[PDB]
Amino acid sequence: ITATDVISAVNDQNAQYATGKIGSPYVYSITMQGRLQNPSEF
Amino acid sequence: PLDSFLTLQRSSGPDDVKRFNLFPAAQVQGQPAPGYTSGQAIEAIAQVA
DSSP: OHHHHHHHHHHHSSEEEEEEEOOOSOOOOEEEEEEOOOOOOO | OOOTTTOOOOOOOSSSSEEEEEEEEEEOOOOOOOTTHHHHHHHHHHOOO
């Protein structure tokens, strides 16, 4: 594994966010979290 | 398909969030009762807290 390999994963496997919502008597807003959030997950 | 790898998990959260003077804080509003004054309302609220 070259250095650029690690760069590419750590860059790509730490995305941002993406959020939409469902719309019928209710509405819910659904999120999707790509950001890592603790050293163990890196 | 997205549900091959994405699982849908229910949760309940705040819509907004307010900080006031560097602290997390809830915003509280109200009026004096009819016949009472802005100072009576302020005194009442401050007693209540």
